[PDB]
Write a protein that binds this ligand. Structure first.
Ligand SMILES: *Cc1c(COP(=O)(O)O)cnc(C)c1O
Ligand SMILES: *Cc1c(COP(=O)(O)O)cnc(C)c1O
Ligand SMILES: *Cc1c(COP(=O)(O)O)cnc(C)c1O
Ligand SMILES: *Cc1c(COP(=O)(O)O)cnc(C)c1O
Lengths: 456, 456, 456, 456
């Protein structure tokens, strides 16, 4: 009697998926040294390694790409992108960059100095790389609830105001800025509340500090505020977006997420000092100030995607697919970081491969098993990703050990989601049989997960 | 434990769907005079009016379009298309046309003369137009089982050999050729067996007549032979395709169906007499002999699509979506032409709007109701489409009265299919309440369904 | 001191040109039986066989194609095209067709009956085919000056009002309409004056007859009115366009010319009787009334191209290239139809191959020689194209014998134009050596030039 | 009698050019503070500010873009690009980056340490930025002839072997590698001979040093070797390309030049130590090792462009346009860096605005004048670009003071080139009238030319 949900868009172009045998996968995963980053695209059946830059654009984004201005200085495509951003966020100063880590690279080489601490909620791992690489400290202040995977709360990505107050009371003198990541990617794609953004703003104001939003998934965050925060049920995504950024002094964004483009990023800010200070590094690292390592056609696609993905229906379609996957997982009893976030499901490996020693890397082992089972490639957000202690050279076994299933936007159907959950069900139903994980054979000094070799 | 089915492709580009209120639809269906062909695209939520030319192309088809040769004579794109066709069918003579009815127009103005009878299984309605328009008779010889909607048989589209033998014994002298439509579109997208194609070939051979295949959905037909005809379980689609056309003297094809292109068609044949006889009409009606009203980029896309859609996985994905829709209909008890065909579900209106007089057009009434309910546009394959008797000026109430739900290829998800079936469920569950249909206000002389005005 | 002219556009995408040896061309022209329509695209170096549908679209046309609505009924792309046409011409009734001869096919099967005469200026050869094919007479009333190739006048394509008055005084009863072709293609792409369009309108009004414009190159015509007709120097192309069509009752158009699209056409009219009378034939020959054998993406490209090519700068760039080619021809003393027209140069073969008997087809011989010389493919607009007398079966040697050099829009540079003129210079400078032309070996009944076989 | 030259390609898509009045330009150049980098694209009529990334791709590059694999790890598009590079250069290790300065950024943060000297021929200015920014010295060893603008020699970009020998004899201990830029961009796009590449290789071998080629225009360089170096007249571009890179240990390339793509770059090398040492910086600055800040569709376009632009005809078409521009300049007596190079004409401002003090920046003044005259935007390669001395804070007035006219590949016609030369003629013919240049109002610390404000 009630019409069931369906996507607010329809398909205009397709591309093939390749299928494979378990015998083929056995040898392919061996030739990759059991590191899925080393698997070839052609060897993956359903690729969930990340939602970054893997999504399908719309017909209006492709039309925008046919109008790209490729001129080196002052392209119409850049002012197009610029005005869209200012319109949507209120920030008047825009620096284009080619991706998110380039925006961090450009901005942090002005703002981050040796010895600084940069507090916030959970820093994404390229973001942490650009802070620690400058001999600064990325200080996690996420609420403790984030590490209770089965605890259900509406805004598990929030910053604990007590934790932030403490760092600033003790080190305000070497705190150059506060960074809030929305949604909170590494805590499992969990949203941050408008209340919490005001909390952060009020504390930053007491200590006269600027606030930076890592904004890769700000649109997913605005959807969660609309759906869960009382007082926002009737506001538009565009309304909630502007309210959010009124509480920030600047943003950095990998547009490869909530722009739904295959490439692109930017810095945007209200502070002339930041704009002027970062300009030099964009010219040296990315390109001239009006393209920043982005094609004209790519900034056009981004301008259109930012406007398109700040509309409710499009966000709703994306996030209900993620929730549908969760629903299937729940149906099979497979534990994950609750409640389902915006962009991915984070399967709690500690509670799936229970017969595998933490020292033998369970989440990485689960990654391998799922790929062997059905050719589905996920990504480990656990012990290997967390790196070794720089002085003790010891592994860090006390954090979450998760298998991330990141969903490229508007690429896979809910039938593919059924295959994912079923393949995961099969692995889960043989847990009392999975007793030895993996062992690092060769290992890099930093961000080893990209390049680590392994056995078994 | 067994992995469920999923599509053998993934999405690369999307476009929006527009939603509407019942109040908007009320006025829009009135301003169309309750003829859905007159509704604007923007006023339809899910468009099932036809699978012809409405499908989504693949990335390799779009790449092929970037290489289109637009030269007026001898484009590389034409020889590309030509060699693909000869390769796949064995026919050496190809005449390009812009669509299917153009291929009929071109070929029948050489072959069809006044007074001829053209027997076959159920002739599609543009095909019938080009025979009757030349004062010839399109004689239906489909097996009688086709009109038993609830009877389940594997090849309900077959030609009855007794019926064909009879016409030829009586009128062989004015029979210019036999036409077999594969799949049988107007009988509900029902397949024709390889056995039946040999039956037709043997009778045509006895009377020394040529055989023409209306081939718009020959690929769907080959899939049904592979899946249902004993002795073909292990043959490739490309194998079955060639076997099929070895039994024909020529083909006519709306490539807008099983080419999965938005435009295109052709004649192909093994008879030099046919090739030479139709050439003049292509130049006069369509264009020069090496493009035939088709862009170079469009013949490239067609060449690629013919090769791509003669592969099992792609056909399987398409046809299981249609079967999934059927499964939902069965779950709600909604009657249709069994078993589900290749491209569409034909809801049996006689058994859904049982409280509506045949004189008040039930299937057309159901079309209107479904659009009012959920904005889904179907198409009436019943009394209105069947036209009036040319001499008696009376409606023909003894044929099937169906609502066709045609599925554009690779456009809608199985979630959209759930919405379709649910919307249809709702209409069905209020059948004891739907007592007056529609009345023709203005009416055309021939093919009135495109242009007919109606009330209530 | 004065800046020289340059194109009002720049290049955004290129494609290759193939070069060849004279030995290769010798065999290729033989395997084509010295009919250049039979040459493969790959065997031509510079293709001037026609400007119809061979042009390069703009970035905004390609963007429009990414937004094409492929729905079968009521596509947004069709109403887009429709409103553009009504805006630009004042005609409210539009019937889409896939090309120009389809628009003639559709409209003349309502308007042209056996025994009618259809007077006008020089009828294009598909247009003449659709009149003579219906057993009607296409009566040329072009001013006699058109056949004086070296006479320079501003509007050599005009209709002689005395000639038109005469036919109507004698046969008004069997004249269904008057047709004016703008520009006058077969008289050498020569314009028609606004004065002459009023002359035609006033005579048609005296006899209460409707006027139809064959409008394939109406934009080139408007440019010539702006540049040569006193009183229009300061009017916009869009202004002149509307004034022109205010004097017509309907138009037929191959948009493959002044739309600068690779496919497309339409009928447009102010007469409901014409609209209603042609509707049935569009459904039977072309497609449903809202696409007419055109892709949605193709009607979008057409909508944009009609607006873009009714702007002065774009027309000026096109036509000055044609004039530049003429300037080079004049520099080498090579005679052509003066003054240069809109879309092509018509070399007067009678005055170039003076040592070749008219019976041995000089213009066709020149076509072959130019291709042998430099791989440039032109087209014969002379004795072969003019056909044999239907009763006497004799060739018609009293008309112009021309080699048309048609320039695809925005495809070739002025450097390619230099190559053309130089290659033609070389042939011309050896005229006292070129003494035997060609002989028809095999010949078709009608429009033999497409399909004629020849020797020497 | 001899056919003149024409382009080996034809046009497939166009985009508009905007025209303007001198009054508009007056205000636009003022609102840019007489810095043309600050002019908006829409305010430029013919944009010659750079050939980097501004060119028009081919139909096969656009087809390749429709097949781009956007997967984050192991995209088919990356191995496509990789194998093309290895095939063409013999280098087996490839690191993708988004542009040229990113490839320098990634590679030099492994190779360049404080106190090093990096000798070579004239270092491009982002390249110099990445050496000097690491507190190293970029030591120019170009032959002295390069600064004699009117001296005509075949390989004016060569490295002086005496100069290179000297640096290595004195500082071999702090020389990490030798860099050869081909063609020599900042010396006026002047080629380097194969002989000179062997000279460099032999000296580097004596001191056991590796050689790096800045390879942005290696294809133009191979064309000049084929056309000017004795012993290479009959070798293919692909042959000369491989011979060239056999003498290098690695390359860095802005593919935005001789790839003819709008974005892209890479490092390629034969040294595993370099590959392994740079990997970490690609992940931190550009992206994962199999896309490096490049779209899949962009690496496909690059793969195709590298193969396409290592073919003689395509290079010949490009470079003869540059030579044609030179020919016109010579015709008007306008001095430039002789002989014309690959990609641009460098007008010698010292010999054009002779009535302007060097302290008032003549080349920058000429830039402004040409833009005022005809809306043509060039770029100053003179005193402003050369920066101030880091300790003395004094301008460096002893180098060349040039106005670079960089030609985007396959964008502008030879008619646009005529406009360029004519506009430059007009400025030149009023030199005895141009007596005051410009004055720095606001000035940046480094690479001031991008961001410098000026007056008069
Ligand atoms: C993806 C990611 C980034 C970095 O963006 P890239 O485009 O991959 O360089 C930054 N922040 C978050 C939260 C991310 O998920
Ligand atoms: C679609 C259809 C046609 C006609 O093709 P068009 O491209 O629409 O002209 C012919 N035969 C069958 C079976 C069809 O379904
Ligand atoms: C091209 C032509 C036509 C016919 O158009 P097509 O698109 O080729 O069918 C009609 N009139 C004129 C003047 C033409 O040049
Ligand atoms: C363009 C240029 C570079 C830098 O490349 P970008 O893509 O602009 O970062 C390096 N070397 C030379 C010779 C250049 O001309």
């Amino acid at each position: 009697m009630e019409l069931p949900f369906a996507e607010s868009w329809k398909i205009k172009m397709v591309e093939p998926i390749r299928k494979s045998t378990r015998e083929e996968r056995e040898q392919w995963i061996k030739e990759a040294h059991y590191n899925v980053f080393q698997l070839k695209s052609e060897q993956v059946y359903i690729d969930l390694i990340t939602d970054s830059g893997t999504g399908a654009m719309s017909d209006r984004q492709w039309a925008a790409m046919m109008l790209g201005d490729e001129s080196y200085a002052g392209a119409t495509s850049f002012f197009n992108l610029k005005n869209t951003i200012t319109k949507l966020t209120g920030f008047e100063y825009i620096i284009p960059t080619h991706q998110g880590r380039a925006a961090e690279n450009v901005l942090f080489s002005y703002l981050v100095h040796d010895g600084d601490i940069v507090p916030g909620n959970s820093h994404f791992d390229t973001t942490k790389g650009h802070i620690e690489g400058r001999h600064a400290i990325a200080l996690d202040c996420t609420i403790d609830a984030a590490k209770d995977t089965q605890l259900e709360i509406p805004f598990k990505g929030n910053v604990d105001p007590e934790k932030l107050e403490k760092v600033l009371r003790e080190h305000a003198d070497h705190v150059p800025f506060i960074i809030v990541t929305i949604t909170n990617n590494t805590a499992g794609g969990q949203p941050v509340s408008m209340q919490n953004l005001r909390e952060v703003r009020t504390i930053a104001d007491k200590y006269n500090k600027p606030v930076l939003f890592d904004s890769a998934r700000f649109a997913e965050n605005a959807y969660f505020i609309k759906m869960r925060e009382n007082g926002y049920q009737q506001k538009s995504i565009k309304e909630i977006t502007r309210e959010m950024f009124d509480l920030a002094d600047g943003m950095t964004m990998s547009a490869k997420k909530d722009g739904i483009v295959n490439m692109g990023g930017f810095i945007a800010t209200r502070l002339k000092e930041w704009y002027e200070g970062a300009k030099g590094f964009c010219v040296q690292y990315e390109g001239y100030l009006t393209y920043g390592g982005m094609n004209g056609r790519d900034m056009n696609a981004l301008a259109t995607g930012l406007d398109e993905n700040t509309e409710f229906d499009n966000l709703e379609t994306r996030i209900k697919q993620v929730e549908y996957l969760a629903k299937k997982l729940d149906e099979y009893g497979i534990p994950y970081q609750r409640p389902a976030g915006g962009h991915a499901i984070f399967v709690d490996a500690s509670k799936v491969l229970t017969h595998v020693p933490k020292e033998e890397f369970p989440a990485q082992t689960l990654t391998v098993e799922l790929y062997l089972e059905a050719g589905i490639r996920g990504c480990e957000i656990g012990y290997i990703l967390a790196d070794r202690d720089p002085v003790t050279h010891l592994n860090r076994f006390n954090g979450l050990d998760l298998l991330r299933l990141a969903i490229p936007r508007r690429v896979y159907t809910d039938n593919h989601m059924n295959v994912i959950a079923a393949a995961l069900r099969n692995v889960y139903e043989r847990r009392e049989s999975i007793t030895h994980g993996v062992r690092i054979v060769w290992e890099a000094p930093l961000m080893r997960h990209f390049t680590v070799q392994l056995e078994r």
